[PDB]
Amino acid sequence: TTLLNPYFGEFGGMYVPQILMPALNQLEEAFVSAQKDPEFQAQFADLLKNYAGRPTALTKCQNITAGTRTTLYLKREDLLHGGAHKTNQVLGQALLAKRMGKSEIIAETGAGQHGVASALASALLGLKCRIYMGAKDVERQSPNVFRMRLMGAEVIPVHSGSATLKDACNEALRDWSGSYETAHYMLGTAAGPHPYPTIVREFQRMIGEETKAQILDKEGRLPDAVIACVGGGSNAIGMFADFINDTSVGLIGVEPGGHGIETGEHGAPLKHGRVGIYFGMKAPMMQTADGQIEESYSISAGLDFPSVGPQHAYLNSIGRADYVSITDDEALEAFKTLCRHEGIIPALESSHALAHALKMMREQPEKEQLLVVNLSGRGDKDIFTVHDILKARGE
Amino acid sequence: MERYENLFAQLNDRREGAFVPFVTLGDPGIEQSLKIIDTLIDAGADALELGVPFSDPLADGPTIQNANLRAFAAGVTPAQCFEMLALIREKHPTIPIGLLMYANLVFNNGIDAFYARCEQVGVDSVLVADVPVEESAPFRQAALRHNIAPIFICPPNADDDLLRQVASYGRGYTYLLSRSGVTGAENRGAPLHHLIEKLKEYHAAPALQGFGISSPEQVSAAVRAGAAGAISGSAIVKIIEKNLASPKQMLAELRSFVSAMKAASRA
Numbered sequence: 001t002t003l004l005n006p007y008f009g010e011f012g013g014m015y016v017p018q019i020l021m022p023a024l025n026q027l028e029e030a031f032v033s034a035q036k037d038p039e040f041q042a043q044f045a046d047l048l049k050n051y052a053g054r055p056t057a058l059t060k061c062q063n064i065t066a067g068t069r070t071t072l073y074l075k076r077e078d079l080l081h082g083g084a085h086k087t088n089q090v091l092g093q094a095l096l097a098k099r100m101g102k103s104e105i106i107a108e109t110g111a112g113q114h115g116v117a118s119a120l121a122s123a124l125l126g127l128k129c130r131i132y133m134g135a136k137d138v139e140r141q142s143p144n145v146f147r148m149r150l151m152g153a154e155v156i157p158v159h160s161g162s163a164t165l166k167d168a169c170n171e172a173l174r175d176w177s178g179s180y181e182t183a184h185y186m187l188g189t190a191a192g193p194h195p196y197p198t199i200v201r202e203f204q205r206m207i208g209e210e211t212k213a214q215i216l217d218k219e220g221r222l223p224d225a226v227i228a229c230v231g232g233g234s235n236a237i238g239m240f241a242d243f244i245n246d247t248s249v250g251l252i253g254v255e256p257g258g259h260g261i262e263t264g265e266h267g268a269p270l271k272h273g274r275v276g277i278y279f280g281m282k283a284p285m286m287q288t289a290d291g292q293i294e295e296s297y298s299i300s301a302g303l304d305f306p307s308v309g310p311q312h313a314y315l316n317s318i319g320r321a322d323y324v325s326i327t328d329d330e331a332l333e334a335f336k337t338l339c340r341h342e343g344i345i346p347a348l349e350s351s352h353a354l355a356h357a358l359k360m361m362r363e364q365p366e367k368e369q370l371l372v373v374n375l376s377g378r379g380d381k382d383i384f385t386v387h388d389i390l391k392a393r394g395e
Numbered sequence: 396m397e398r399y400e401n402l403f404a405q406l407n408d409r410r411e412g413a414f415v416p417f418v419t420l421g422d423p424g425i426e427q428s429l430k431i432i433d434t435l436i437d438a439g440a441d442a443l444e445l446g447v448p449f450s451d452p453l454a455d456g457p458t459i460q461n462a463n464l465r466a467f468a469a470g471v472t473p474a475q476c477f478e479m480l481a482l483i484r485e486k487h488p489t490i491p492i493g494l495l496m497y498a499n500l501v502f503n504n505g506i507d508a509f510y511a512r513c514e515q516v517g518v519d520s521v522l523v524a525d526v527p528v529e530e531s532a533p534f535r536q537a538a539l540r541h542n543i544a545p546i547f548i549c550p551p552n553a554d555d556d557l558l559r560q561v562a563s564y565g566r567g568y569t570y571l572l573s574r575s576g577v578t579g580a581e582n583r584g585a586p587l588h589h590l591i592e593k594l595k596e597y598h599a600a601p602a603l604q605g606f607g608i609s610s611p612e613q614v615s616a617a618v619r620a621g622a623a624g625a626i627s628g629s630a631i632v633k634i635i636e637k638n639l640a641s642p643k644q645m646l647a648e649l650r651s652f653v654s655a656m657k658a659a660s661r662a
């Protein structure tokens with residue numbers, strides 16, 4: 001029995017060991033209560049405004065679109081405290097943990113942004129934070145690991161399975177399966193067992209709500225389409241949510257195409273994977289023919305969650321949202337383009353969304369279109385990656 | 396078939412508990428795993444719980460995480476596991492064989508087809524570790540269509556509604572969890588006689604206590620509390636891990652251990 005529907009069509013559910021069901025029911029009840037609680041909402045809004053810096057800018061990018069009939073705005077989640085949209089929902093979940101009387105936080109991280117976001121929220125709000133991270137990710141994300149430690153978090157390498165994000169996801173759930181009475185599991189995307197896909201959407205939906213108000217103010221209408229990259233789905237669902245009922249507004253999710261869909265080295269489960277059951281949910285995922293979970297490949301480490309949130313799979317199934325892919329090379333060009341023509345260094349994750357918008361413009365340059373790209377983060381973290389690619393290809 | 400029903404009736408006639416080891420199929424390779432399993436049986440195992448190697452065993456502690464990894468290192472696939480299971484059943488006609496699965500391996504090629512393959516090879520039960528009662532319907536329905544017992548987990552904190560659900564839905568045995576957390580011999584768990592009594596009142600499948608069982612005294616205690624028997628996994632797998640370099644010594648130590656554990660179950 002649950003208060004809310006755990007499914008989006010056929011997708012979603014609560015595929016956890018029986019021992020964890022009371023933790024999910026507790027979290028759901030606490031969420032439902034918090035959403036009706038004006039004091040909770042006020043506290044959340046206060047942190048978002050005065051600590052994280054909301055509302056974020058909506059920037060019109062004129063240089064990039066000059067000579068076409070595309071008008072392109074970027075929603076500047078890159079300007080949020082921490083440098084990515086992840087900060088919004090970790091503040092909300094930290095408040096839910098406190099509402100439930102918990103003083104400890106568990107989190108998984110891959111590339112490290114969720115770990116950092118969890119560590120910062122936990123530092124601010126007096127929670128003891130422990131973060132699981134695949135050992136291969138630990139080795140390759142020394143900056144983010146150091147940030148987490150500076151913020152007082154315990155970072156625990158995970159050596160099991162593939163020693164990457166999915167293995168950290170497992171380890172977090174193993175811990176919670178014994179510690180849920182005192183610890184909250186601060187899941188990092190709009191995926192996993194109910195109620196997480198719902199909670200994360202609701203704690204990211206200010207992106208789309210702001211975008212809608214900002215576009216109406218500047219343009220006097222709704223956008224033709226809003227475009228967002230899709231790793232696990234949090235930034236995209238946060239942009240999309242407030243527009244779902246605006247049937248004229250296109251919702252475009254961009255999965256990583258890696259070296260190319262046809263190579264198999266990609267991270268695009270929604271369009272090119274197979275539905276399975278893993279990480280507490282029924283959803284498209286990257287898996288072998290016999291059902292072992294595989295890795296999502298992208299130049300962008302932040303787009304390596306090997307599945308996708310169930311609400312995206314549902315919105316695709318009914319044709320409300322459309323999902324596309326962008327390759328490493330396309331993302332890299334978009335990254336370079338934004339730096340050179342707008343003076344904004346985008347995260348390589350976000351660069352996938354921008355690349356698709358640039359394609360929409362370039363393919364049909366005399367099509368009138370008002371587009372918003374969710375610029376989910378800044379790309380300072382990516383400059384070494386990009387430097388290394390440009391040098392290796394001899395640019 | 397009725398392999399668990401027959402086993403528990405026979406054990407009852409002897410005022411005897413069941414001892415049930417867990418191992419990972421194909422750990423540390425197919426041939427040695429087959430010999431391990433024959434040893435467990437010869438040494439006194441009443442039933443088996445057998446794991447299919449899975450990439451993401453999120454209810455398992457490090458001991459069994461490592462067992463899965465060793466089987467993967469040996470190239471073990473679900474298909475090869477089903478080959479193993481057919482051969483185990485062809486050697487041993489009455490011993491109940493239960494699988495420990497994760498949901499993706501069951502759903503992968505279709506839930507019905509998975510349980511049909513279990514029936515074909517002579518498996519008696521399936522426990523899907525990441526499927527709670529709330530999600531169980533297609534799994535338990537397919538199990539029963541194929542004469543497979545769906546095994547439900549009873550947490551040590553189960554309320555009356557859950558006990559009634561597990562009692563009604565389950566067959567074969569009811570898995571009585573010792574404690575919260577994940578598999579492992581390090582953490583000893585369960586104070587379960589209250590649940591045991593309620594499950595009996597609700598005509599549940601007989602209870603087997605599992606998680607943290609690593610010593611004879613715990614087997615004795617489980618039966619004394621009214622359970623039909625006990626499951627031990629990590630303690631068995633630790634003997635495999637410790638003795639990888641000497642397959643002969645591995646089998647000798649497995650035999651000794653299982654003999655002692657089974658002795659604890661006797662009246």
Ligand SMILES: O=P(O)(O)OCCNS(=O)(=O)c1ccc(OC(F)(F)F)cc1
Nearest residue numbers: 017454495524578579606607627628629
């Ligand atoms: O002796 P231990 O502590 O290793 O326990 C061994 C148990 N092996 S098993 O196949 O029964 C088993 C039973 C249930 C499990 O998870 C679940 F409860 F969530 F379903 C996992 C393994």
Ligand SMILES: *Cc1c(COP(=O)(O)O)cnc(C)c1O
Nearest residue numbers: 084231232233234235349376377
């Ligand atoms: C984490 C991250 C993503 C991908 O995660 P989603 O849950 O899909 O949003 C995208 N962009 C940035 C900058 C990120 O930090």
Ligand SMILES: [Cl-]
Nearest residue numbers: 002003004005
């Ligand atoms: Cl509901």
Ligand SMILES: [Cl-]
Nearest residue numbers: 007009010011
């Ligand atoms: Cl459903």
Ligand SMILES: [Cl-]
Nearest residue numbers: 216217218219
């Ligand atoms: Cl105006």
Ligand SMILES: [Cl-]
Nearest residue numbers: 224248249250
């Ligand atoms: Cl449109």
Ligand SMILES: [Cl-]
Nearest residue numbers: 383384387388
């Ligand atoms: Cl540099």
Ligand SMILES: [Cl-]
Nearest residue numbers: 397398399400
């Ligand atoms: Cl049976």
Ligand SMILES: [Cl-]
Nearest residue numbers: 487488489490
């Ligand atoms: Cl037999």
Ligand SMILES: [Cl-]
Nearest residue numbers: 473504509512
């Ligand atoms: Cl199969």
Ligand SMILES: [Cs+]
Nearest residue numbers: 053054055056
């Ligand atoms: Cs601002």
Ligand SMILES: [Cs+]
Nearest residue numbers: 065066068070
């Ligand atoms: Cs323009």
Ligand SMILES: [Cs+]
Nearest residue numbers: 230231255308
């Ligand atoms: Cs994805």
Ligand SMILES: [Cs+]
Nearest residue numbers: 502503504505
């Ligand atoms: Cs399927």
Ligand SMILES: [Cs+]
Nearest residue numbers: 562565599600
């Ligand atoms: Cs029953």
Ligand SMILES: [Cs+]
Nearest residue numbers: 615659660661
């Ligand atoms: Cs005894």
